[PDB]
Symmetry: C5
């Protein structure tokens, strides 16, 4: 992993420590364990809480995408149970809903939505969408129109119109939810100080351990350092949920899963 260099720099710090041990008392430098326990504990506490934030936030990102799936399932269902005749409205609204998903993925990944949109929508609509500075939000507007048309067509009463509007309000909360997550990281200060104090602590560690361990310092100073670094490096792997790294959310697969659902619900 990205973790295995500091682990080794640690072994080499154990070794710089073993064969440097006697010029110690000469200088007057002595290093006991006790204050490094007070430190190491206070750091474990702060590590603990921080990781908690990181995990909460990765979970919130998962919830949010989970909701896209639930609302578009519902909204499609409602269209099938209320207007089971109109399949043109069906196919239209479904393509916007699928478009919203891909569009939001692209948005969070800062990639180009254009191919996906052109695959699902008429070119005139793609033009409308990409013209907006907020293309994903503009897709809700369009979906909202199809709904709105059916309403004044008289196919939908204000009641049933409202049932479907509420699902658009949910997609609206996913969109803001995601935008917020993507511009509001766990504050920088956390991951900075923890990263400094944890790294310092791990490299200073075999120095204040050698007096007690002698030769069995590497296999213990490593084991202690693996532990703190495995924990601090779990926050890292949980703080970019919209990424493309292995342990980020599989938004591509999720978008494919969403599209496959709404198509199962409409015969295609």
């Amino acid at each position: 992993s990205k973790i295995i260099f500091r682990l080794l720099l640690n072994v080499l710090m154990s070794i710089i420590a073993i064969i440097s041990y006697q010029w110690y008392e000469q200088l007057g430098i002595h290093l006991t364990v006790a204050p490094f326990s007070l430190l190491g504990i206070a750091i474990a506490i702060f590590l603990g809480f921080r990781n908690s934030a990181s995990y909460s936030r990765f979970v919130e990102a998962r919830n949010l995408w989970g909701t896209v799936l639930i609302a578009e399932r519902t909204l499609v269902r409602q269209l099938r149970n209320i207007l089971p005749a109109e399949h043109d409205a069906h196919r239209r609204i479904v393509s916007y809903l699928v478009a919203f998903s891909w569009s939001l993925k692209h948005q969070l990944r800062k990639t180009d939505p254009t191919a996906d949109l052109r695959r699902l929508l008429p070119e005139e609509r793609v033009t409308e969408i990409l013209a907006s500075s907020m293309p994903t939000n503009r897709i809700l507007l369009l979906a909202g129109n199809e709904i709105g048309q059916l309403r004044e067509a008289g196919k939908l009463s204000d009641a049933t119109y409202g049932l479907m509007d509420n699902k658009l309000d949910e997609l609206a909360h996913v969109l803001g939810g995601c935008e917020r997550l993507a511009t509001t990281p766990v504050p920088f200060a956390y991951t900075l100080i923890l990263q400094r104090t944890v790294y310092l602590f791990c490299t200073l560690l075999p120095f204040a351990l050698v007096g007690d361990l002698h030769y069995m310092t590497p296999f213990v100073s490593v084991f202690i350092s693996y532990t703190f670094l495995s924990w601090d490096s779990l926050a890292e792997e949980l703080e970019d949920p919209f990424g493309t790294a292995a342990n980020d959310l599989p938004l591509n697969a999720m978008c494919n899963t969403i599209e496959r659902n709404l198509l199962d619900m409409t015969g295609q």
Copy 2:
């Protein structure tokens, strides 16, 4: 888990009869650093277990909602269309199918017997055809509700009162799928799992200094405490897991099936 306590008891007896040669080559092991280690590990097991618990509780609430929504939906059908018992039985079928289908979905088991029992094989082929069978069942339930509305028997206002219930089931389906395919840390629950193991096997080697012949007893006390708390996290982290406790999920589906037959007068026997 009872296996690596013996391994611990052995690793102790190894460290006893062996911590004669340790003095040779100057290799030492205090208790202070294994106390910094262990308290940090304990702090992290704390937070980890806290996350795991939270996933367990969320799964309970979700299933909790199935019971609530289905009871309310069926109550709504009785209070609003007290006469329409053919619709009452069709919808209660789907709702009961929904729950079992869900359970089977999360446990990765075959739902066919349960579906075949509850619904006409036309609809069972249809549902089994789909790759989202539980979702398909909601859609069918929606149709029954929908048809009562075209038929003129439900107003848009009172159709809505029921449609809310199906949204509530929709949210449960999604929530559960998110928990089932959502091991938040991909195989880093594996790194932390082994970190506790190394610590519980290296520990008697570190403790033997101050305890001697008492080492296997105080080393296995401590190991059991850590291994227990850790196994508990694994059990909670995965409430629908490849080896969970089915009892409550089965209990929940039987409760809701019983509940609904009661509400629609199928019970007690005439």
Copy 3:
């Protein structure tokens, strides 16, 4: 009976003191630092555990709080929307009061027939007792009152819906309570903590006595009180529908609910 094993710990100290003489002559040594470790780990786990229990107790308290709110405002909607319909008003209210007591009985695993017969006609009592879930049944009946008022033109779909929502909220309380009860916190959870906290407490003197000697029991009792006070509080909060000291005054809560609902419909004790 927590003073029960506070007492036993004192003797274990004595057993540790009395026998400290001949276990220099037994090849046994027991230091504090390992028990500091173990003891802190357990403290940390007790800390999180206890936290989860309080959360369950607050939820239960809160669900019950919602019975009172929902039922109050269902009655308020009955009065504001149908001021003339006092027959409905009292039937419904007798169901909602029946709902509350039945819920207490359900949670307490006790017979609701007394309280039921008191509040409702026996034909209804039988209908309700015939059911796998009498509280469910009672919501269904309250539902028909509301719903018959609708067939009869006296409630619109809109205002029927307003009241249906309240029945819906009660359903949620019912399921919530049902869940907090049929979900005793995971099996391999409490069993590990009692032994660990017990075993640790009764072994602590054997380790404390090298440092403390005759002081062992005073210190060892203090430490064990602390851990046990904490561990036992978790238990009594864990089952909030029981009859323990901080176990919700469910009878009192039920009375408050009945006095409230009677005060809204013009009646007196």
Copy 4:
């Protein structure tokens, strides 16, 4: 506060402990610092969690009062956007809504609503309200009547009556909330368990510290005692958020804001 008494009571336990450490070996009492680390840390952890539960109880209280201002604000707003003419239902309802706030404050403060209530209401109902064992609930039932009246007087549709009924529901939940936080205190075993243990731990502490610290004992021990006592004290200035205090909710200030706010939205 009352704290400083047992700060000094601790300084005196320190001196007693110093000038009786000589009779220790004589009496047979050894007191090492290490078991009081295990203890003190455990007590800290339990103190940490407890304090945490009290904070959240206080926050729930603030949110509940937050909801009163919000609900009453938008109920009045809804009245002005739906029935902008009918200023005499406006004034009746705004006075009922203000009565509610005050009646709630008084109910929680376990004091007397009669003065504040007569200032706001015609006493043909002020006696009705005070003749109920649940005055504040009765004030909602009456606010409900005004809305109920406007509905059956055709000035409100079901739709619009609904929109406003939902705001009464919201106040009902605040009432329940507050009452619940009043009658169900934080489980009482928490408090006494904790400061039997905290106070007993701080008085017993110098007798174990003196072996190591000698004359430095009162300084260090008063510090440690300050810390714990402080934290434990903070938890109880938060456990009773409706109470008689300066670290409690400025309930009077909050009702004054609410009353000005509702008068301000109607032009008085």
Copy 5:
């Protein structure tokens, strides 16, 4: 960061400890680590919790502002969807909504709204608003009259009027949510209780540290003093998240984003 001052000051104190260590038993002052190791872990635990409380406040504040964006977006959507033609109502309502954000941030930052207020509204209104002792709430009420007017003009039905109405309720909740976090901070028993205690501990720490560290008591004490002091002040920063510190909320960006959004392309739509 007023930390470097206190960090170096600690280095002073940490030298004083090194020069006066062998004169300890001459003055009668022994000072071990365990009492400070105890004291310090307790302060860690409390710092950990309090910082957790602070982040909660930050996170909620961030959430409340996220909702301004969401709710305003969908209210405009609802108006473009239900009354697609009514663009002069659209324009009026959007200005009130953009006014609402700016007005709120000024309210929370304790600054003057009038610049931003006139930038957006007719002057006859910029004083109806500035006149109320609660302006953000007055701006809402104004946005409400617009929706209400469309409703009496029969352009909106009670149903669709309600859809829009709810979105203004959602905004009333952000308003109160934000006042709650402003007016009520966390108890200022966070000098006497936390800020001063962490420091008194940090300066005394080397005096109890030297005997062990000898010639390392400025370093290890400044490492420890860093860690503790970082977390106390980060905590203090995050609790006032409408503040202007480096880790507070970007209220100004957020209001731009809201503004750019509702005026998405000079207010034009499909």
